[PDB]
Amino acid sequence: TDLRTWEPEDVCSFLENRGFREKKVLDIFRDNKIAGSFLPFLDEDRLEDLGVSSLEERKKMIECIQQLSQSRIDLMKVFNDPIHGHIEFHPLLIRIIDTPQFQRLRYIKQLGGGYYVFPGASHNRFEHSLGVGYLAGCLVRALAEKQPELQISERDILCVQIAGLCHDLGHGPFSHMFDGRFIPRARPEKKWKHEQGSIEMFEHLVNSNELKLVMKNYGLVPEEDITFIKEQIMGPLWPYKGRPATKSFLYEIVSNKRNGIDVDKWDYFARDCHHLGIQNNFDYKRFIKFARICEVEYKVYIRKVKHICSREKEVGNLYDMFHTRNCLHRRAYQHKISNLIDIMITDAFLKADPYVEITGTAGKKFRISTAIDDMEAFTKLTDNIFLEVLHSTDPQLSEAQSILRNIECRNLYKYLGETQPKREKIRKEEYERLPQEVAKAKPVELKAEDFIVDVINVDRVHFYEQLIRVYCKKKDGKSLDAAGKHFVQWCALRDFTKPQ
Ligand SMILES: Nc1nc2c(ncn2[C@H]2C[C@H](O)[C@@H](COP(=O)(O)OP(=O)(O)OP(=O)(O)O)O2)c(=O)[nH]1
Ligand SMILES: [Mg+2]
Incomplete structure (x- = not known):
């Protein structure tokens, strides 16, 4: 047979019928539940540590294990x-x-x-x-x-x-x-x-x-x-x-x-x-x-x-x-579209987060955002959640779905361009302001929500910048023009690089 099939007692019988008949040593094997599969990975020192103090017995034990059909390399x-x-x-x-x-x-x-x-x-x-x-x-x-x-x-x-x-x-x-x-x-x-x-x-x-x-x-x-x-x-x-x-x-x-x-x-x-x-x-x-x-x-x-x-x-x-x-x-x-898609998926998730239930340990319900708090919930949280939302009959996710359907029909937020800060950088706190600033900067009604600003940070060994992308959610021509020039003016105002 294989050692893989062997229960601990089977190993004990093998050890006995191979000459090791002392109950203490058999007790070692029963106690640690050393099924057969472990045998070819045992050491002289392991046998020492498990507790066989017979300096020669360990050697003969390992010899018996070596003689067996199945080796270390045979169970990799x-x-x-x-x-x-x-x-x-x-x-x-x-x-x-x-x-x-x-x-x-x-x-x-x-x-x-x-x-x-x-x-x-x-x-x-x-x-x-x-x-x-x-x-x-x-x-x-x-x-x-x-x-x-x-x-x-x-x-x-x-x-x-x-x-x-x-x-x-x-x-x-x-x-x-x-x-x-x-x-x-x-x-x-x-x-x-x-x-x-x-x-x-x-x-x-x-x-x-x-x-x-x-x-x-x-x-x-x-x-x-x-x-x-x-x-x-x-x-x-x-x-x-x-x-x-x-x-x-x-x-x-x-x-x-x-x-x-x-x-x-x-x-x-x-x-x-x-x-x-x-x-x-x-x-x-x-x-x-x-x-x-x-x-x-x-x-x-x-x-x-x-x-x-x-x-x-x-x-x-x-x-x-x-x-x-x-x-x-x-x-x-840091691809401009890949990140756009990540932003849209996130945006959908945010609007789906309240209604999607995910059960964790003892069946406590968790939201997408809180599954990270329970591993047995998080174990269920995968990319598939994308399709679960998209295909759900729950009408509370209609908002979330519509975003995902847009990803499906390649109806993504339009990319107004990239910019660079000439000096200084943007405080991690300062981020939430940015869509407001772009909206409010004038050269049409353009809400702060209609914009996303995406801030990106570009980022020893021994021998012997900041990128800002602006996307606009509103996809009509006139709003697109307005938003584009809003962005240009915002860039000019903060003394940022001329957009891409
Ligand atoms: N165990 C396992 N094998 C995987 C996985 N993904 C690919 N493989 C490959 C590696 C293995 O060489 C191949 C066959 O492994 P199996 O345990 O399923 O059957 P196998 O024919 O090797 O029989 P065996 O267990 O060696 O007696 O499957 C995985 O997630 N788990
Ligand atoms: Mg890795």
């Missing part, structure tokens, strides 16, 4: 990715992957409104998350072997991979629109980051599916390692609790907001380049091979830390990466 699962080719995942990762909480990422478009501008961009967070997991695994492995002095363990590697998988667990419908346009607009009081949702949903994931025990049986320590995983996704003497300062570099792998060089970016750069039809000058495989940990000292008392570093002559590689970063940002991410 191989995904076929067009970005990364084939991809092996350790079974725990699969257990995490195969949950409602995670599978939900199949139904959230990576580029959100993007798909409605770039028909190639049909890809969702699911496959990108897989990719990030895999890449995380690659870099941590490479550093582990090249420098075994680092004491990087299997455990660490799995935690890094899991952090990888789950960095985007907490995105809402249409990805960045939800956490960047809708929630801030619907819950201005609340500060919310998709990462917050990510760690909350991971906590939910492991608990709804009782993977806490499973993690233990694969050699993780849930209490420590879950905090490690969470910390990697979220962020912050030594602030982190998940790992000692001696293992600091691990935190630079999955999310590195400092210098913007991490495996999340690598995957979605490559992937988005793949689907948009853009050629990506950056070979990450070259990066990982020439990646080494080495110590850095900055004097503030001098501080000494272990950062991830790359050979100095692989600086051209980074020039290639940052071009691609800019290339994507310029052409695709």
